[PDB]
Design a binder for this molecule. Structure first.
Ligand SMILES: Cc1ncc(C[n+]2c([C@](O)(CO)[C@@H](O)[C@H](O)COP(=O)(O)O)sc(CCOP(=O)(O)OP(=O)(O)O)c2C)c(N)n1
Ligand SMILES: Cc1ncc(C[n+]2c([C@](O)(CO)[C@@H](O)[C@H](O)COP(=O)(O)O)sc(CCOP(=O)(O)OP(=O)(O)O)c2C)c(N)n1
Ligand SMILES: [Ca+2]
Ligand SMILES: [Ca+2]
Lengths: 667, 662
């Protein structure tokens, strides 16, 4: 078959699958089919029979609405994605969801759909390869050596996140990153000139990319020459400007916004078959075409060669090889649990009243020698977030390092870290002030959706930060994280809860963990062995009374100290009170019914929540017959101690609100 | 005095105020003082006696941590910002908060601090000036003619939002936008070359900006020449690459990250006074320096000249002049309330089962002829969000238009719209799929913080959107909006609630309004006159029983129909059931307690919330002894009908959960 005929197989499967689903996006798959045929058949290093091969090239579809493009490629090249699944495109529980999802489907590297985040993930995968190669490669043993290829469109280019990640990719001279721009002149509103007029080549040159202009995206020879040129440039990431026609093949819809996002229709599909010379019925592919598309034999051979290379590496570097295998699997060091518990116990036995941002740094310092897989960073706030430990080494200084200066790029940072976690070999941590999680919000959600391990270090968590004022002072951000499916959120009250939360985060294999950390010093609380162990259960009894409590305080983070003081005052006056520390609502909710009842007994309705965050959240635990000492407004610019006074975070006010509540209950 | 001495007054006030507060950022004010002296003294058209003058130039400090720069400028030029306020920098309830805040302080145009958003706001202000000029100017009567000036640093440049808004500014040929880049080579982590290496000038030329390279930011002559050149280029926004030294004047801290964000210290301040040759004590400014800085006389002359121009315009164009005054004040047409109510009443009398995204478009169509101040748009989703009406005219085609194609730029769109609202003259609406509010989240927050009127049209609100799947299907986004201070959030259940929500949004004078709208068709509910009037109260009794209810359903948006169906089944069994429609929790919460008690009586604890969004929100209204039929997970890719079934949005499940409570 000709290269065009082979590319047309993608066009047919894509338009036909969209038609059967009566839903989906045929335009981009039809526009990019020739580029995909060249990349996948001539260049991509992969094994369909082992999608987890450590040294495979990584491909990312950033314009993820063109999902049938990747499903066609995976099916045709011999991945475990049967034709029946393509016939079930966009149907419940199929392996072919409307936008591609990692874990759902053999060979899908990341979940896309939100424009711009795919290219960010690809930048992270390229950083991971570069860093892992520098750490593990040895003379005569280059066990890490693979490319990262990304497809992206106008939407990804317009999004601000593309600026963040492609700027940083230039700085880091990511020579194994090669991106293909689907330059088709069309977006949803129509011809892009009305809203998008960048000289995109000049923009990427400004970032230090190697740009290849004016590629005929429908000419295999032109595409191939461009890819070869990009592969020859080892010191810059490359952008291939591929001029394509959206919906290529459709006489009446090619080059129009109509082809972007809806079924072509049966009449137009018939006309498209005629234009393309594609004779086969929907979901029919002849054996001859499979023979040319299949990658099982080449894939086997390439992986077998790599396995032999790895075996030789293991002979010469046994400890390094064991570390490589452990880290690629995401497994923890065998002695980590014991060593982390020893650290936690030491902290409980040796009180220190320090900011939880500092307690976080101390945990990084303690874990750093144990977790060489750390690849950590901050969005230009290293001296504020406290993300550097004594063994930190920035990768812009030494490629074998373990730290990334992300610059003022919160969204880019977080989506890059998603790419790092997806790659394998590393445990990423990222950091900014909690407020600026709002800049990165959808990337945080994507880590949770993709079930990725990433520790998110969010400092300066409340009005406790003081003078910087209401644009910086979080109020409603923690509640936003708490209600995010599969997110874990910890607001530790002292250095001990901080270390427990850090341990929980690094050991959490199936989702991310956000640490909500203070600028200001936090009092250490006293704990029995049982209470110490109970921190990890998310919510636990910290102070108690004999018999049923009349009153339960529920507090988090910096406000536990305040709740304990109120508990002491009320106790001295003969009130039967309890304090529950709730460092993680999500972990508490995951405990069984009996444990939750032991902490928040259903009989006790006089419940007082205390937290310098939005009050409305706390109805979940206090119900309609309690009280909340929280925030209901934005903050103010002033010294923190005056803000806590102003907003009612005082012993006198907490005691007054508790007594007021009890008075209401009694009458 | 020399220009350097005049600029040094800013340096002294800034380092001294930071020192007294033991908090703040002296570096950028000291680095930018010479640029500020040239811009403010030689070019800026403003009146300190009236910071609200309609035709003033707008200045924006995008690198807002350098707040003492703007406070120094406002004080020195004669705004109502006394020295005592500068001595109360960063102190409770002062007019000098740590980052500048619009409303707090005479002359502050916007609230900055979140990097990148200032330049976005400035792009919005320049769009507003260009559009207002095209709408209102007439031959011989150019009543709108002013510049938008912005200062910005490396942080703003690194942020993605700068790419979004500066790209669009190039497309729109904003020739009266002039930005100054504080090119000082330093950020918090240290020397920027480790993380920021863009050829920024080349980048901005790629956007179609006019770029002036290699300006000596400490030389008045160099700066002045560059501003003149930028003002001569009328068809492109301009970027001035100003090479500066952060903390300029400090022998030991200039050019270091140390000067960025902390007091210099007493010893270093003494050395700085020596290096600068500044002989005045903290908070001492001599009369000669005030005399050269003060702008009261020139400002009043310029505004008076403009007032005379406006009076002549009003004689020639009385209807247009009245519209200008109304729109600049943000006032609504006197008959808008009556006309909108007439539209709402018509919808209730003429039922239609349509998507609330379509009901939204219909409200835009109804209101369009009444609100010429609309400046609306969508982030590349016009045919999906349904933001065009018959009178929409895109400003890239017709400068006097009322519609913006924002491109795939949610964050930039929203912060641009903040600039549009801050400018005066317009009522902006913006739009994208609800999920992608997450891309714009901090700009949404900033609209609320700044008390700005903007209608945010968020369609495709739930699993009801169907096949696009969990990356697109909102679950927890509405809950996040609901707990945002000063945000109004409406999730209408039909075309009637949709029009009421739109009316509420445009009539807000002090904050934004998010509309939570469906992809799929929603059934219209029957309403009495009292129920119809009570939609605007945010929560109301839609279906009832005789006497005290035994069971109350609380539902929103697309789930009201489901709750009504459950109510009908239980009513037939003889349960005293009620359905409450809760289109807006914030509007409900603001009602008097007697009204709230009439809808959700305190004695009735058997409450079932029904909404295709995160369950945890609803404890606010159901407490610990109710039930919630909600989402607790991400969505899935499948047809909407099958998703609603899969996730428990069925009559059987709603009835079963209700029967558990009873
Ligand atoms: C961050 C972000 N913003 C907007 C979108 C929306 N959007 C996207 C989608 O959501 C697909 O992913 C929509 O096509 C929805 O499926 C439409 O839903 P219905 O109207 O059928 O209900 S795609 C997109 C335009 C992308 O333009 P491109 O130039 O990137 O792509 P192409 O040349 O058209 O291949 C835009 C603007 C997104 N996916 N991500
Ligand atoms: C969207 C966003 N991200 C990060 C920041 C943090 N940030 C900022 C601030 O927040 C000031 O606004 C911090 O200086 C905090 O005051 C520090 O708090 P503490 O450590 O004293 O507790 S400024 C900034 C770096 C800006 O670099 P630039 O090059 O823009 O500014 P300059 O040359 O240093 O004038 C960076 C990175 C921000 N303001 N906005
Ligand atoms: Ca396109
Ligand atoms: Ca700087």
């Amino acid at each position: 078959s000709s290269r065009k005929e082979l590319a047309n197989a993608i066009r047919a499967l894509s338009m036909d699958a969209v038609q059967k689903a009566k839903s989906g996006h045929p335009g981009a798959p039809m526009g990019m089919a020739d580029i995909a045929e060249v990349l996948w058949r001539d260049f991509l290093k992969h094994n369909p029979q082992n999608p987890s091969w450590a040294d495979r090239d990584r491909f990312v579809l950033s314009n993820g609405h063109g999902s049938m493009l990747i499903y066609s490629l995976l099916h045709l090249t011999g991945y475990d994605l049967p034709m029946e699944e393509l016939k079930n495109f966009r149907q419940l529980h199929s392996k072919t969801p409307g936008h591609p999802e990692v874990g759902y489907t053999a060979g899908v590297e990341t979940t896309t759909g939100p424009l711009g985040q795919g290219i960010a993930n690809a930048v992270g995968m390229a950083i991971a390869e570069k860093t892992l190669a520098a750490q593990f490669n040895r003379p005569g043993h280059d066990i890490v050596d693979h490319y990262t290829y990304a497809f992206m469109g106008d939407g990804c280019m317009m999004e601000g996140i593309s600026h963040e990640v492609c700027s940083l990719a230039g700085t880091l001279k990511l020579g194994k990153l090669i991106a293909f721009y689907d330059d088709n002149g069309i977006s949803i509103d129509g011809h892009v000139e009305g809203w998008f007029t960048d000289d995109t080549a000049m923009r990427f040159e400004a970032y230090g990319w190697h740009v290849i202009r004016d590629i005929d995206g429908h000419d295999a020879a032109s595409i191939k020459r461009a890819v070869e040129e990009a592969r020859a440039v080892t010191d810059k990431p490359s952008l291939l400007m591929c001029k394509t026609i959206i919906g290529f093949g459709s006489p009446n819809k090619a080059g129009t916004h109509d082809s972007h996002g809806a079924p072509l229709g049966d009449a137009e599909i018939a006309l498209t078959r005629e234009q393309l010379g594609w004779k086969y019925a929907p979901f029919e592919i002849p054996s001859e075409i499979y023979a040319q598309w299949d990658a099982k034999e080449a894939g086997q051979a390439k992986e077998s060669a790599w396995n032999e290379k790895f075996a030789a590496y293991a002979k010469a570097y046994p400890q390094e090889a064991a570390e490589f295998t452990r880290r690629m699997k995401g497994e923890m060091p065998s002695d980590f649990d014991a060593k982390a518990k020893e650290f936690i116990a030491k902290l409980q036995a040796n009180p220190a009243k320090i900011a939880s941002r500092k307690a976080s740094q101390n945990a990084i310092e303690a874990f750093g020698p144990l977790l060489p897989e750390f690849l950590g960073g901050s969005a230009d706030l290293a001296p504020s977030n406290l993300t550097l430990w004594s063994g930190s080494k920035a990768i812009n200084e030494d490629a074998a390092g373990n730290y990334i200066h992300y610059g003022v790029r919160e969204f880019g940072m977080t989506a890059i870290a998603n790419g790092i976690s997806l790659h394998g070999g590393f445990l990423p941590y990222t950091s900014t002030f909690l407020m600026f999680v709002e800049y990165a919000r959808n990337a945080v959600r994507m880590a949770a959706l993709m079930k990725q391990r990433q520790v998110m270090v969010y400092t300066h968590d409340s009005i406790g930060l003081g003078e910087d004022g209401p644009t910086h002072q979080p109020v409603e951000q923690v509640a936003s994280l708490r209600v995010t499916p599969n997110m874990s959120t910890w607001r530790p009250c002292d250095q001990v809860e901080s270390a427990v939360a850090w341990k929980y985060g690094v050991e959490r294999q199936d989702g991310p963990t956000a640490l909500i950390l203070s600028r200001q010093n936090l009092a250490q609380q006293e704990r029995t062995e049982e209470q110490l162990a109970n921190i990890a259960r998310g919510g636990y009894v910290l102070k108690d009374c004999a018999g049923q409590p009349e009153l339960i305080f529920i507090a988090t983070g910096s406000e536990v100290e305040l709740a304990v003081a109120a508990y002491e005052k009320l106790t001295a006056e003969g009130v039967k009170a309890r304090v529950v520390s709730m460092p993680s609502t999500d972990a508490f909710d995951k405990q069984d019914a009996a444990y939750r009842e032991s902490v928040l007994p259903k009989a006790v309705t006089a419940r007082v929540a205390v937290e310098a965050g939005i009050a409305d959240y706390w109805y979940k635990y206090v119900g309609l017959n309690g009280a909340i000492v929280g925030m209901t407004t934005f903050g103010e610019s002033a010294p923190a101690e005056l803000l806590f006074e102003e907003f009612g975070f005082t012993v006198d006010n907490v005691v007054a609100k508790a007594k007021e509540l009890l008075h209401h209950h009694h009458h």
